[PDB]
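Anyone? Bumping this.
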Amino acid sequence: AKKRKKKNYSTPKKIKHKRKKVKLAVLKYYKVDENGKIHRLRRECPGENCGAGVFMAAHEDRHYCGKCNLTFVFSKPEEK
Amino acid sequence: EDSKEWVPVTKLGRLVREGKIKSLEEIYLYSLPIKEFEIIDFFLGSSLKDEVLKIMPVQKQTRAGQRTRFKAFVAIGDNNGHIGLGVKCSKEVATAIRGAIILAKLSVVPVRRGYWGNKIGKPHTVPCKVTGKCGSVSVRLIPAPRGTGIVSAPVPKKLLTMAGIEDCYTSARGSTGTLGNFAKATYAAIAKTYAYLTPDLWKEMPLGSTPYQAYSDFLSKPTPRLH
RNA sequence: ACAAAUUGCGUCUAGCAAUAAUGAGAUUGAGCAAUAACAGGUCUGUGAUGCCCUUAGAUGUCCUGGGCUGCACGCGCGCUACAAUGAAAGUAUCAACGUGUAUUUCCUAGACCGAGAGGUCCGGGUAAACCGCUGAACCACUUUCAUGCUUGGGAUUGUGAACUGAAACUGUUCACGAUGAACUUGGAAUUCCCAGUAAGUGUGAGUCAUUAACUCGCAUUGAUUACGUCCCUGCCCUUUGUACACACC
RNA sequence: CUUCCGGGAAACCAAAGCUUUUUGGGCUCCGGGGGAAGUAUGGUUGCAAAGCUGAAACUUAAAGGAAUUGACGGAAGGGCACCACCAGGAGUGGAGCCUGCGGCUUAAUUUGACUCAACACGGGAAAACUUACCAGGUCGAACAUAAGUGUGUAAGACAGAUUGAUAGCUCUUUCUCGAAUCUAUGGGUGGUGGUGCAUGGCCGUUCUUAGUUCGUGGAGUGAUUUGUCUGGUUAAUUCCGAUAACGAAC
């Protein structure tokens, strides 16, 4: 709250939130088939640049790894 | 620490530093011109303490825009029979208060103490009625009997206690709140105590010694003799 | 001039005299500047700074912008001229303080292209060394103009051509070919100044990616007139009246 | 006229002294702060204009006495520069244009500085940046306290809105390194915010002159004077010489 000679109470109301947290629970969602096979919910990155510990996103037809959210777009782009 | 061993300007202080004058009255017979303060501190310094009267300011008017100067009335005096007065301008207080007090040592006067009505036991107050008229300030001194202290204004009592009187009816007329002639006139009032002929003094004298002639041998030698 | 510098010695003391020299009749200009001060200037030079103001919703701070440049008006500081001691063309052919790139793209030469503006290529130079011996302007030399707001004077305004920078639009400046106003010496006023000075006429430096018409010195060309006076606005302390004071506001 | 060696607050005084010592040669009027006011009110006197005569409520903390200092503030005497002329010169003030700033206006046209000594100055020749201005945005910054617990306290991008751009600044929706436990709380942080009448520092004027000021004395009750000159000469308080501190110091 300033003190200026002319302009008082500008009020653009400054609503920029910090984090909604209306979604995105941490991965308690996990199913294990009994004795002894492990089923990986949020199946991991097929990219070899990480150790596949990123829990790649379940999304629309654009998924991504967790270590970098914008990159590793699941389209899939084929290279030739 | 002195810090400096006193040098005689004149031969009078040369005589007292040689130890051939051991009497403060020896200059006081012929009114010897004492223009070094060190002789005052030679005989005295014991029971010779000082008190400031004021530190009152003045001003000198210039082209631009003022000039402020200081002025301090002060009075040193031996506790029985001596007093001194003086003042001096200065552009700073510490230059005055350590320097203006030197002047009153040139103004040390023997104060004669007298009885009032009975000739027993170390005369106390004043010989006779003496006024000091100086600049609309006429301090009239009136002798008093015992018990009754030095009545005065509130200001000049510190002079007279450090002179040596105990008992005196004393006033003056005028504006004592203009203090500048007030303490000065008392210095002329108390000085006149050896300017009054008394029938106690009607026998005179052996008529003189003149210690110039009595000590010309040390005067005649050009050697800087110690002791 | 390192002054016995010769000069009817002035109150014996500092007689102007230029004149003696023959680099030299000061080679000679700034800088440094006290005392008491003033409500001079600045807190926006500063992580000098009191006090006060503020602090996630900032005045702070970084982005996007604008604006400080906006214009019927007042004004000051300067440059452009008001042309015949010239405007044109060439020709002759002259400086100097300086200046210039290491961790940022300066100074540039050389060839090359381009009406130009500028663009390309190979260089030099961290610098008495290369730019550069910087081969500066105004003048000087044959002409062209016929004094006609005129080929003097270049404001205005289109246009493309540039180019700097991410980026231009009361504008980045520069080119070409158009456009030719106002103004012929400037009312009352009022500026500075006595010699290499005033003044003309330039270059460099400074702010700079590009923008000088200012600014700091450089250099060339080279006067009239003064060589005093105390009127006038001045100013410096000796007597001097005053009611003068926060000083005739 | 001289000097108290008298007296006064001093200039001045041979009496204004001898009124000093809380003093005395005689006699008379006559004053107790200003301004009210030499006005009223009556008497008295004048042919009149007017005089001898003279108060008060009210209002006021000062009015003046001599002296020192600021005026080598149109006032005397003497000496200096083209910030002053004259003898001039070039100019500007006219014209054009560029900038200083006011005024105008604008969302805002940031603002400092008013003679000389604010006025091409804050180097101020700014597209933005600077910038302090206006309009949209934007960052986060301590601490114990403290409560989730680490079932994600957060932190980032796609995606479409919002945007100026992508600003996951926000967010429809998605995975995510999550721990500075991102606290409401101490409060400190920052600012080209305020104030040069809070200052410092710096600078300008006072300064193209020629002046300041200290230890000794005699001037005087003190202020402060003397020094620092009557003259000569000097750009010069520069020296000589009178020479009244000099040895003074700039």
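Late reply, but here is one note on the structure posted above: The first strand of chain B starts at residue 48 and ends at 52.
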